[PDB]
Amino acid sequence: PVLSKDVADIESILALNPRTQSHAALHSTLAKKLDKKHWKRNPDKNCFHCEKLENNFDDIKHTTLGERGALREAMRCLKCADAPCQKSCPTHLDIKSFITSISNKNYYGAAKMIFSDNPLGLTCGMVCPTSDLCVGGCNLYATEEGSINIGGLQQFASEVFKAMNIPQIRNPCLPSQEKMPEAYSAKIALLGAGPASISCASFLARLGYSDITIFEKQEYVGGLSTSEIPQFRLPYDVVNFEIELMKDLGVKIICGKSLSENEITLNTLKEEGYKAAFIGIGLPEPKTDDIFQGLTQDQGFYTSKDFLPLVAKSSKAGMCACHSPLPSIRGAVIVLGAGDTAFDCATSALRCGARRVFLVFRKGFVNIRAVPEEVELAKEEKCEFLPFLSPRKVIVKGGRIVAVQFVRTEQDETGKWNEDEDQIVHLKADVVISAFGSVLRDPKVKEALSPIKFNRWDLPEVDPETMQTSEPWVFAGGDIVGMANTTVESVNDGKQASWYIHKYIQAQYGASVSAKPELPLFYTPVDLVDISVEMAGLKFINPFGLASAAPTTSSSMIRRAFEAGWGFALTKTFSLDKDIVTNVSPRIVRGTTSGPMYGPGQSSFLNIELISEKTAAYWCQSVTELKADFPDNIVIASIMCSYNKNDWMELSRKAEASGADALELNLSCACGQDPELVRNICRWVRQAVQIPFFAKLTPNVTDIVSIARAAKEGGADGVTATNTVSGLMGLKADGTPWPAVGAGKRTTYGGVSGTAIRPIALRAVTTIARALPGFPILATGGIDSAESGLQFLHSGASVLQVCSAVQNQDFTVIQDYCTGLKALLYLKSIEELQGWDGQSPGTESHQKGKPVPRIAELMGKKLPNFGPYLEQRKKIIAEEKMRLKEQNAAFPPLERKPFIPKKPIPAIKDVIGKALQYLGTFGELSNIEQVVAVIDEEMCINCGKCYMTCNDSGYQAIQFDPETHLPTVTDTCTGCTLCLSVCPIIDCIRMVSRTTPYEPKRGL
């Protein structure tokens, strides 16, 4: 046979494989019009009817992210200085920091940052109108690809933390309870269990107050988050999770208790011994209109305060223990108003079975004040919009609404709004829902607030800085004060008030508080995890340190690094006076190792920098200063001399005398290629000083073990592995290099740093640790996260040096690294999370980060998410929602119980070197335990990359269906694993144990 030619059935498998084209393609316009429908992904501009949504409370948010999408979007964020997104967030979330933690896979640290400034952090990620807040300030709006999805990233990190099932703990900076001053036992009352009071009580509990009670009128908690925000935007379980975190702090909630003249009043609270009160009851009554007087729900009329709680009680399991039906809303529905409630009524009316929904408002389109993302949900669900119409009468016949009568409105040219009585509309309708807003009108509630002053708008007046009412022991915030338009602002109101309630209460007990407000952060048991490590007789408070490099150019820089939390730092390499150098410029350039991607996350740098231009005298005096001020932070002096015994002894003694904890010998800036020279330099230093010292090894050697062993034989206490890899980062198209120095545009070979060299450094660390067991290793080379640091610890290193990740960012990454490592170690003790990979939950089947419904009629039926297959999927899902309208839904636990460690939290010493047991020769690998690839069709996005890679880099083993674009791995798979390695969807392809007989393909 012709061995170099595909047989017919392989040619058939390859039918859809890309080929070079020699001619232009003929396809008629008519044929193209038909074929278009088969592949269609997005909405069809010619489809005019709603997709059937009855009883469908699936998540419809466009911002929801799965892990794959969250990691991509978090790496895209520029992580800006003085970031304007944060300036535009009402609770001042450090967005730069929490997104940095997501990009480093440290979802705990991200969640901790979010909840530190916003105790309703998951609710807000889900519901914030970010285009009018943080996202509206995002610098990336000035790029074509646009602003960052801050809300979805916040939601993703908080959802992971929620799944971790870790409790909030008492502020660990507080004295123990029995030693708290008496003032912290003051009785505190909050009225209403909505976002404002939940925030306020949370922050007061952080400060140490131990007798905090929220009094809630209803039998459910959460306020509007629970009673009106739809389940398909905010799942009820999110609310319960945030309330559970608050109860972890000891806040008490009593339901069925109202602020009202005949129940709880300011006077009764005072007479019962309460020292302070926060009013957070919101706006409990609908704004009503005379033209709807006397109309009942049976006739077809609702206010939004009637309608949305009925829908929420029916669709939110565990909200109201009873199980309620969805309101029967069939026919034509008119929603009146154009605020944000109106759009929730319209989308909710479709879930109750409406046939058609009209939003009717009395001004124009340009005057809609709902945020665009709110408007777009109603738009994409085919709601009709009628502007410039003011309601006049509701027509009732046979006891039911049949029509609403409107008059036309218009702006004259003083901007006044007029009604035109001769211009009427008779609009047919079966249901009418007014969404005119909300008010506080109940006289008995307002009287219970005597004697605080009310303003023009019938609302309690507060000082906007302190949230204090006219009575100094009473504070208010949230919707009842009338400034907040959002959950996040109501949260911020309670946060703001908590500091000044604290101030007031302390003063009442004769105590002062700081002139600078200081609210505590959010804490969990993770934060108590010990990440110290001992190596070479030195105690490191944490294992992260600054490498000898550009971030240690000056000792003032090291000072700020220690103030930020870094466990240790190297000096830039310095030398004796006679070895003074002068750097050239340019000398540090970005890596080309991952394509033309600019900004954050450069995968490498190249430098042609020399030793420090600052003198030994500068560096020795600086080390003395640093060790005087930061005795617990390890300072290592990096030094270099030429091959000369007297010089190495002189310089090492000078650095030792300054107080350096240890020295690092730069042999890798060559002496460091030759084991005999390395051994001799180490011997000279070992005879000169008594402090530990480490030889910094170059990776540019045939066998790095031979030079590590030489350093050890010379008396080094350990080795730093490794310095930069020698390289050339490339050329312009005209041939000139970058960096190009001087008029001659000259360069020399440079050192490559960053994540591109991590595989080389990991190899070096493991091979040294296997050759020299127990010999201290300081790792450097691409460490940019707690998880990558843990890879080096697992590989045998004891501490972790960082350069490029700081060049890509700033010193504050240390806080991400420390919280992330604490979380990785903590999670190893949780038996329930043992199937996670570090902080990543096991991937579930998802499309666009939303779980695929587990419906029998959808599985295995080869229905991809496009064209007529998508139409079939939507019909199947809709029928299953109707089927579910007849059945019980369980309750969640009245409230979940946290996971508890079932074994000790590992210390760093317990994880060092644990990867080495899996490392060996090729002959120690099984060739009989073979694997094959298997594709989860429900996660596939139909790109064919697995197919293209098996075709042109593999075994032609994948069928790619010409109609569904679904791949199937066949039995000729060899398990090479290339398809998994190119698939864009994390864990869509998995390698599984081969079950059928295996025969290597010998071609012969």
Place this chain on the structure above:
Amino acid sequence: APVLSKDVADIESILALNPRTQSHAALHSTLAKKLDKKHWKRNPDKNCFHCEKLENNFDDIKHTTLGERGALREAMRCLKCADAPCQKSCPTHLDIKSFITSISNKNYYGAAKMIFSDNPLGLTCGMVCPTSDLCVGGCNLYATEEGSINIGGLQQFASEVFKAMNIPQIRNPCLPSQEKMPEAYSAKIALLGAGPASISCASFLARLGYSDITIFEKQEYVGGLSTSEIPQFRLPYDVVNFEIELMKDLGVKIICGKSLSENEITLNTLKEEGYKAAFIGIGLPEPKTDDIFQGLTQDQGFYTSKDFLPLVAKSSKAGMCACHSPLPSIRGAVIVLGAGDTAFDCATSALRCGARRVFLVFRKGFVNIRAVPEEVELAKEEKCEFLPFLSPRKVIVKGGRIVAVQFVRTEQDETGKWNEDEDQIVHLKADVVISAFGSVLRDPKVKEALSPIKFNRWDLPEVDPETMQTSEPWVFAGGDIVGMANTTVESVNDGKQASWYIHKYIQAQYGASVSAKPELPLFYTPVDLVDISVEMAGLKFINPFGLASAAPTTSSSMIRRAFEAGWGFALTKTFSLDKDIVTNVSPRIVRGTTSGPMYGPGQSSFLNIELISEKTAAYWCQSVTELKADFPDNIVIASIMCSYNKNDWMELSRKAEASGADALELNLSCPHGMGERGMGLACGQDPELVRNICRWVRQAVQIPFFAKLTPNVTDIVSIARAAKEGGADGVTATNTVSGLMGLKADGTPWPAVGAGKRTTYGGVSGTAIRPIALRAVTTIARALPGFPILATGGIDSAESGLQFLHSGASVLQVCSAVQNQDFTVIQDYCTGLKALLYLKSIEELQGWDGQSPGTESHQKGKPVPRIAELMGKKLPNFGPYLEQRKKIIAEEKMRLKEQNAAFPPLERKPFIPKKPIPAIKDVIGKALQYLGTFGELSNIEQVVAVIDEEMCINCGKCYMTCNDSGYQAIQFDPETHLPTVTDTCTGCTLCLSVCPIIDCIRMVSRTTPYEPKRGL
């Protein structure tokens, strides 16, 4: 000495905005936050009812426009899908996967060539295609949160770069010379109307070789609706001219002033004058009217879209007319009737004419608007009002002017019938009324001129939808006139479809057949004639790109298909004698972690623990004979490995030579000895062993052979020199870098083999090792000049290939870039290399970096207005500063109005090479002169960073990098977030390296005195 390790007051102040770790939650009142939010605002303000001023502002408003930075990022995001659904969804069937692959590889010429091969109006279509209803509507990435690819903006970008290159289209180089074309190709061909349909039809007919093609156009201008109605702020007129001039390069003639009409041109007159075929592409030339508008005039304020949009076009498109046309004075309230796509262009154009308010009023609902959402969004963001369910009944005229329109309300039934409620009326005040009810063909003289073709019930010419032939076999039609096409691209496609069957018909009239498979030619320029062959070690390569010995050459059948795709050469997978048979483990090839958790296209590395080929020496040797018999001009190199044994190397190398291999490659990865006498375990790490192996092979065979070096050596030059001393004809530099790609959080490796989850060190490949391979190639090339080098290591484009050629390599092996994609990248590499060599001869493009134009000051890839009162005024693009920028721009648009001069759109003349096009051999090693020792670098000629404030996006990354990795030399303003480099800059270049905007920071020669910081 003071405290050296503390910042002085001046530096503490510079560091004021530097990020710091917080120990406490931050207190900020809700009221203060409300008052601060406005300062930073970037996007539209939902509370703003107030459309900013747009009079005489014809600047690009498209959301899809891309600059180079944005285009590269978006092209790398594309999955480059097999059997791609976006292409299925494009009416001209563009190979979107290929052209976007080219853009990601910086080959903008190859992208534009692929675009224009299937669409001669590719730049126009990139700008105006309603992609959400076409290609983008099918994009697989719609199934991700980040969403579908901006295909149109990518197409627009590549085409814009190609337009800037100023390269002409050439006659199809596959044709015989003109004088030996058959007589049939001189048949006289007429096209009626110079719109997209005819321009496309004439282009493809000219590609086929027809030499007498004339388009007869009614008007004095050309381009059809693209010229006369699509607004300048969506489609610049110079785009239309550029595409017209490309077609004219093929010899097509256009005659303006001559109409298809009774008493002018008719099908009868064309026939009598000896035309053999005619294409009707006159569109729909007349407005759809409404009785209620009878007798109303422009002076009263009434326009159809066919009156209004050409008036705006004539005034705003320089080079449309000779008349400097005044913009229509459209002051007051404008009512635009209808809600198709024309109505929205009327609305936005009315604002450019000075309208105070625009109402878009339509007789159905919102759900019934047919316009694409892209088009609707532009009218909404410009604050047009939308009034649904209104049907016009009366235009009110007082004092010679429209003052109002009265409407009736509309309504749907049970039956879905639309009704009008006479008792429900709207009286809407207005100064101008523009009807956008569509277009028609209704002129009796024009239809008469088409006698006797058959017309359908819609008074349009009938065609066969597959052939575009009318009922008269010599007459074809397409575009708007046929009534199927709703877009420029479908009209282009109608002319494309018609050209093949016009060709078929004409050829048959002259007694000739055509192929049963339609074969329209591709698009060509002089770039495609560029020679990219190279000679090396006596071997002739037809291009310098070849498949490395790796997974893409697992089987000889794959090499066969790679040769069919265009690869110049290929290596076999390394093979060995029978006694050295191996068994691979699985898993064994994994993605790199070298650029973080980015999945899918463009993996920056792979790691593999793969062995030699599992297939026999007999398989490989027979395969090499077959491949060399079928592809004599494609070079096949047999890769072989033996243990350190003279008889084995001689036996295997002779076997491979006898099979007809052009050359051998010695894989020096076999272990020998123990392996750390300083020279490690593999034979390729010890110079003595390499020299001996090479001696053995040199004795055994007479064909050239090359030693494949490992980068895992202290001194690779010593191995290369040993191979040369042993008699090798060159070296392959380099194999993979030894590494461990990473560990799971539980400590297990990946790849993990077996239930034990074991691994061993693997080889790292891909762009992550390119700096290592480039250094290895360069050092060998400088130490052993003229010794042939085959480069390997992260080559994934023509641009990166040329870097290796400049560094001393002669040919270019590829593995990982094919693993990331498929064999067809070779097409991108070949056109890309042709284009790079072509451009070196073009003096006018010296300022470009390869195919990249010099970066102009931009925001979102749109150029910033060069306005004095706008430059250096510390006005970033947010908050109150943006609103001052908008005021300054609007005032300057007005000053450009009240003086209505300047109509000089340059006449387009292509650049000519001023020197010979370099061959491959002319560029090899030309970068090596810039290399040297560190002491050869000037420390006297220092640089500093300088920032272009107009390009900055205010992120402060330069500031943060200088603060915590540099010299604290940048001031970052607390209110504008604008950075300024101060005189303490050392030129280290880290800020430039982290800035997200290409060329926002530049390094310039230092002019002030320089002193190194010594700290003392």
